[model samples]
Target: SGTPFNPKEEIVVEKFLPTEGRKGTRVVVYGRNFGNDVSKVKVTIGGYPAKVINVKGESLLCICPSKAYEGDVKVSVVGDDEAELKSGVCEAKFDYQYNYVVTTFLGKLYENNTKWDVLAGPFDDCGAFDNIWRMMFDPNSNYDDLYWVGQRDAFRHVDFVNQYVDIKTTNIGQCADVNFTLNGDMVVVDDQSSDTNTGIYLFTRASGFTERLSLCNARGAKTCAVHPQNGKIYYTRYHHAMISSYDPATGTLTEEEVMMDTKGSNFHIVWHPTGDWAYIIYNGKHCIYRVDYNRETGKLAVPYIVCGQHSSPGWVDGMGTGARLWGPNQGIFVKNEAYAGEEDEYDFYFCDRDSHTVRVLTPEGRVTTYAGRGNSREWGYVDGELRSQALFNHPTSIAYDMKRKCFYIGDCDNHRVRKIAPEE
Candidate 1:
């Protein structure tokens, strides 16, 4: 520490890219008088020192400190040679936060969601990038096994009892999403397009083989949800103009109304547990849209936006009545014991692909924070006691385990499957 700077000649801060996020969030700072040697400059948020990634004359990128508090972030910068920052700290630079957790894992699932158990990965055993995208219970088993799909590999089955994974290929390239049929078999999407094979594939457990269904031409399939009562599959063709449905038994393809016209984009569809409605998520769109599907006829009505603002991009947690969402990817509907025994009461959980947080929308249209420390694209493995204190690196998919009364997360970039359970 040598330089005693004049306040008038100190570096100035104009603005920051994000107003909020947790540790490891790379914040882009814009201002003037920032000298070239960014490495020699000290950056701090809420009084915590941050690591600068890059520095230009007028702009700098710094990583948020992992231990910063939740109050208004005060961004300040000073020359490393100075004994102290001559420029006053910029107060309220941004906000920071970061899980549901089970008792054994953390404590509770909703309000106290936090800690997690590394269920099945962070490994490259099955190869294909070792990224588990989506999974479903093996309907034939009593929640003892799971049929899971990998983003770049074969669809496999995992045994909860044995604690092992078995790769069962469907003769397809990449299967992104999966579901179980009424007959205890599997209905999965072959997300790859091939000359002779692709589209949807049926996993016949009895014969230990998979055969492609007639619903071919599924090039950009993303995810699928199964109706609780009818067992039909509703999936999104990530690059297509419309959402599509398929009946495994009838070999039928019913094209639902197109949500958009873009060919290559991200989207997801989830069926309500009660089997009466479905919710859709897409990039740069409203929080979510609603679809009313008849229980018996298997026909879906024109979907409409139910709650939340569309085309808004930010990390915010609020009620379904007025909350705005950004880049929401996966949504899962589960039983809410808080409203136990109620017919339509369910917890709607979703992941903000851009925000790296898991949030929920209650049946009463009240939206609440579920998991993750709203760190923008930040990833970590710290087991936080409070759900919101947890961190995730671009979580892409989520699956709930009814038997264990918990939820499993496809911690995408973290290369692991995390388990969030209720307290004992």
Candidate 2:
């Protein structure tokens, strides 16, 4: 049945690692078509489906396969309609990272001709455009365009591009995968803001499309990642009161595998130094969660709360809803950029919690006061703010190095990305 659905023809394949190897144990899959809509396809190798893999925007990586019968491999995708698609040559010549590997997601399908009005409204006609959310980044001096994930114009590719990936996903809720690839580089998005998903989407370089990775965990799965010691992957799902672990990397999975019972609802997850335990942040609730993790056994034990949660958005002075918005910003971090002002100003405190807590630590560390008791701006938000806000105060986002070693947090409410290391 050749449906009247206009198809997609955009560059979905990304991160083609130019490795020079006859064979090895490392592989990186790059390309688009991995988002909420198309995240329904199942991925497998030698008939053994990938148990747990990182399925983020535009790229996915899975261990070579449980079996070792290596010849001409076959990597394929079966769409939501039960339609099967396979890659041209599953057997790549080499498998390893390149040194001066000048890799880029520059498929440049920005010249594609398609329409976007096909998508109507979702909840309240608030515009069906927000769901196809995209993020921003920069490879050069300053990012000219903010790379975001959106269904392509024709509506079949769940990919990431400046505004929308060349492949369109007709405003449906199926395509979400081929947004990026993992060539042993920095995985861009750490997590997504959904309850029912682990936030990892499956993507392919071919077809320029992405499908959602099937969740092997309970619904409302939040945080997920590959373990360090054993390379096994893990995730956690949350319901009304209980929170548990879900390992999708291996086929063996238990419903309430890992438990991190907390007084607050936990969401975003970050790993610790040993990867022996996870630092799960209880978003909105204002607390940090610690869970025992074992990469080898795929075992997670009872979790505990590290720091007391903000609980009640507490008292945000600037943003009227400050009290309602607990983490107005992630934490305080600044860089000593010539554009950021001169000298002694780069002495800000890197708060483990919020501005209030971060500022108090400034004295002990004698660091620059990136955050203070004064208003958000008055506290010296030495970052870029395209627009000054009178409603919102200090805000933060998960941040990292600008060039190297330094970390910066993006504060959406305050409209800035604060540096953590004090020096850019």
Candidate 3:
């Protein structure tokens, strides 16, 4: 109803593949006859819509939308008639490992009901997930050790002593992700706007919270994982699949020699217990990918999809090749020892933002509804078997507590952090 462009012009789409990623992955649309203002233009991956984030006269930068298919990407100019001036051309221009997961094993596994408790929050004024986001636990610490939680302005610690929950808060920076070295220093992904203020920082939690160093430079830094095996830290960039590498001891952000990317950004990069491979979230398409790390060269192998799909969002237990997920925010790979005290018996758990539920993906590629209830977005403080039926309103992130064997969830809409505990 505003401005219109002629679709009959000599528009030529030469080629279109620079890189591929999940939802927010930006791809440049080369070729011309494209007018300004992308509102009149339409881009799609398979048959799904691609959101236009930027419109350059020569190239169009677009964001892959939710539930996009793994077919061909087509771009066309639209006019007042609502017809393609240049009928959108589709010739398999894009190759998304976008195969649907066949739900053959639905309702077979993950039937055990879990118990949950409200360890903390409803913050100052019921700030359930108000500012609370990520979490970390000092593994080497004793049973009395404290659990660390990340808030908007600072980080805090919670202790479970004498069966009582003691919550403590700290005033740090905008630390979105946190990890630790072998010694005990806190390595955090500090996300600030300017290049000077944003990057990974090392905080020596001694003397007086003094001696802060910049470990690496990462804009739009989302999350990080410590590689105790090779003495490195892997982090993600929210808008792109560019993972960053850093040396904890030297405070050195390595050069861009080892370039490996993910499908989408906002992935929670968690190091696998084996010390070699790690798991990451594919935000654009609602699934997870397994990423391998090379110690000697500090290179990350291209990540491959493990579970979930582009548009399928239901609770099913089957091969990950066909399991579906809707708007998965973050996930964690359960420690082998943490699960029944065995090795290689790991399970992957993630929070579905749209579904408002936490799901589990077993080693056998079986997906199941782990916790939360009814497809409705609701909030509350409930415990016991009923906790299994308790609803989480847009839970955004999740963290596993190895020593306690529980899950720390960012109950986002609830404005608090909820704890998911296995039945005693």
Best candidate per TM-score, number?
A: 1
lDDT of 2: 0.36
Please, what are the lDDT tens digits per residue for candidate 2 over residues 110-174? 12312123332222221122222223232222333223333222221212223333333323232
Q: Provide the lowest-lDDT 10-residue window in model 3.
A: 100-109
How well does each candidate superpose onto the true structure, as a TM-score?
0.63, 0.40, 0.60
Ranking by lDDT: 1, 3, 2
For model 3, residues 25-99, the per-residue Cα lDDT tens digits are 677776665567677678887678888765554567777665554546777777777776774454435654332
Regions of model 3 farther than 4 Å from truth: 1-129, 143-154, 161-173, 208-211, 255-264, 295-298, 311-317, 335-343, 374-382, 386-388, 422-424
**2 against 3, candidate with superior TM-score:** 3
TM-score of 2: 0.40
TM-score, candidate number 3 = 0.60
Total clashing pairs for each candidate: 20, 69, 15
- Name the lDDT value of residue 286 in candidate 1: 46
Candidate number achieving the greatest lDDT relative to the actual structure: 1
**Could you give the C-alpha RMSD of every candidate to the true structure, in order shown?**
17.3, 22.7, 24.8
Which ranges in model 1 have alpha carbons more than 4 Å from their true place? 1-129, 154-156, 193-197, 209-215, 238-240, 257-264, 283-286, 295-298, 341-343, 374-378, 422-424
lDDT of 1: 0.64
